[PDB]
Amino acid sequence: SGFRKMAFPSGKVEGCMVQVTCGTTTLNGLWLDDVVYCPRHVICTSEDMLNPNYEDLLIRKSNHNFLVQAGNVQLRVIGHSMQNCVLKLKVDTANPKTPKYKFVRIQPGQTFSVLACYNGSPSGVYQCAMRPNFTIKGSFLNGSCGSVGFNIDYDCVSFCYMHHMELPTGVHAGTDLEGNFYGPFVDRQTAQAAGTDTTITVNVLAWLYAAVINGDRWFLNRFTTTLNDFNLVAMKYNYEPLTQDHVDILGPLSAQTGIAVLDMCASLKELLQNGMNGRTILGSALLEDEFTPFDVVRQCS
Amino acid sequence: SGFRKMAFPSGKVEGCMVQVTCGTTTLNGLWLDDVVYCPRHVICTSEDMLNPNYEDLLIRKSNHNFLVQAGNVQLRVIGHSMQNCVLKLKVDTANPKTPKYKFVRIQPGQTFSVLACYNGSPSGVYQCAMRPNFTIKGSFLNGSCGSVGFNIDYDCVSFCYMHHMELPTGVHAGTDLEGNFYGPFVDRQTAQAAGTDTTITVNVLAWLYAAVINGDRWFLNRFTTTLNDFNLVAMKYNYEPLTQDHVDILGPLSAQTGIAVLDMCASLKELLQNGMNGRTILGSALLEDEFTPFDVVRQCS
Structure with missing residues (x-):
């Protein structure tokens, strides 16, 4: 008996969390094999966010501009590319704790577990749903960017969300693991707001x-x-x-x-x-x- | 922004969960170093639960009566002892994934994360409190015995609860990791009920x-x-x-x-x-x- 808000065991995801640093910005990354996935706004200054041209910004960066830290060890960035709103940093070491995984883009109404992280270290785990207006009612502070949402099927981890921003109503917006935002949200400083929500x-x-x-x-x-x-x-x-x-x-x-x-x-x-x-x-x-x-x-x- | 029921990351605990078998009873155990901790009622039949004398029951058992399974590998039981209402099975292999840990007995009103398990495999994680009447409003099914409650301080795991039973109102009762029940509960089939609860x-x-x-x-x-x-x-x-x-x-x-x-x-x-x-x-x-x-x-x- 009993019924509780139940998250999936977070172990398989914790062993993937790293800290990504670019200039003066520090957020989290998801280390799977020799690739680290993170929000592409890590390369931007606050001024760059007003009207960013990311292709033009990324061409100004070198591999040494990116710092990856997994626990105590520092991983060397040997490549970088952009896919939609996510940055993919190729590293010289493949993650030994990479689980069996999938990247899946979920429908509104579907739920997932969130592993909130700060500076590459998991802080906690909780359950939430993708609301019909494509925002999430999460619990995120400054530095939580790069934290992921996921579900577990048998031994396979299905990553469905990466955190990017908080909207003015206190709700959260982000992308799937391929960098496509859920909803009409963009990664630039504009007047954007959550639409009207409905009950699932x-x-x-x-x-x-x-x-x-x-x-x-x-x-x-x-x-x-x-x-x-x-x-x-x-x-x-x-x-x-x-x-x-x-x-x-x-x-x-x-x-x-x-x-x-x-x-x-x-x-x-x-x-x-x-x-x-x-x-x-x-x-x-x-x-x-x-x-x-x-x-x-x-x-x- | 946001406020959610937040559990601690469950990774350090998942790597300790094993399946314990004795005769026809199968529950979970907590593998820390070369010792597996589990509820002592694993040695009992349903008939034994009416008026059990555990000292007399344990003297009838041998090491080969206990089966420990960690993932695919089967651990050999090389010793056994009882401490209060918990059984401690000495095994031939020390757990390589043993984290830094403590056993702590908590006060009523304190919260902890629960990692619910069935057959040695974690099913999910959720947050709850020790109620003033020393029961917990958890979510447990048959086979969940041996699942643990815990908090994480820096890198140290403080185990505070081991699950043993469900009372008639649907609430749950168990012990600390040293086998002492919270509340006036005993591990025998008697008319026992939760007392009146109060708000913390x-x-x-x-x-x-x-x-x-x-x-x-x-x-x-x-x-x-x-x-x-x-x-x-x-x-x-x-x-x-x-x-x-x-x-x-x-x-x-x-x-x-x-x-x-x-x-x-x-x-x-x-x-x-x-x-x-x-x-x-x-x-x-x-x-x-x-x-x-x-x-x-x-x-x-």
Whole structure:
């Protein structure tokens, strides 16, 4: 029993974290084989950020302008290249602790574990989701750039996020491991803001199933709904639309509890219309949307 | 910016997790040097749990009755002893990945990271506190016995918990790494239940300071209180008493925000009397008590 925000074990990622230095900027890098991956804004001054031409800036740099530090040892940079918004520093030593890995670009609504680092040393690990507006509600301070988001499948690490910036609302923006930003964000100092966010509906339904698995079913009812009628109420409460694909993804959780997806949708509809009336679900007074149907399966009985 | 439930990086602990087998029971063990630590109930059948005499049960066992498996390799048990409610299996190989470590017995209200394991393999990591009633609100399934709780100070791992059982309310009970249970719990099948729990007051105050550090201050007021008058209201709402020592521990957070501890106590008093009036604090509709003043300092600006 129990249900907690659960991150993947961070060991395979810790052995990859290095510190990257360029001039007066210090951030983190991800050391995999003989290549160190990091945000390309490491080469910029604050003045360069106003209207940067990175191709023109990188041509002014040499290999000796980059400093890589792994624990105590200093790695020599023997090459450098840019791919989108990430810099790839070729080093003279291949990382002996490189795990089996993949670079994957995730969809909005998907979750991942974050290993927050400062100066090449991991500080902590936590779980979060890619919000529908393509920002993340993380916990990041100055120097956290280069920290990564990931999931673990068997023994393979799937890196899905690299941290780059904090927006004015306190939310965070970054790229996949190939340097493509999630959302309409760019790596330059411009007026950029997060768009309106919505609640991840398939995730709320998965978390209500986890609550049933853990023994709390006060919120259930005898009603059912159509996919269309539920979607009419979802749009009203700023919820993401539920597709037939989401219903299929929720199938294994529906078969374990005995509650049809459309029956669970009628409980969610009543919870949104009537509130909780002073009651909690898995220790929460608010509906939770940062657990995917896969996360519930992995942690539950 | 941001504030999340943050666990310590779990790498140093993952390299210690092994699978222990005795007869038909399989649980996890903690491999440190040439000793494997695990719950002593691994030697018992379900029938033995009714009224066990462990000294008499352990004398019937040989070294070959114990099976230790670290990844692919099988470790030979060359000795065995019991210390309180933990079994210590001496093995022929010292763990090459043993970190710098300590065994520490924590006070109620203190937090730690849990690395949940099944069959010697870590499944995930999450944060929790030792509740005032000496149980933990964890997330554990069958086979999780031997999973450990810990904190990390610089490069030293402080192990504070080993998992043993789940009580009827779904909460969890276990020992320190020297085999002494937290609370009045025993490792036998008897009617045992968690006592009444209370809210960890110094932790709620620390989390309100974290909210001020992150920019939300709607809950502040112009009032102050005495330590005695605040304690009169705390007892009424089932909160732990606040001592002068707790006030001193909250000093660095009080000096960073400019808000006196007794001023923060008057905000908490009003929050308990009037509620939140449809408002949240750090994304939470309930007051949070599983962040110590040290946890806030470690993660905040």
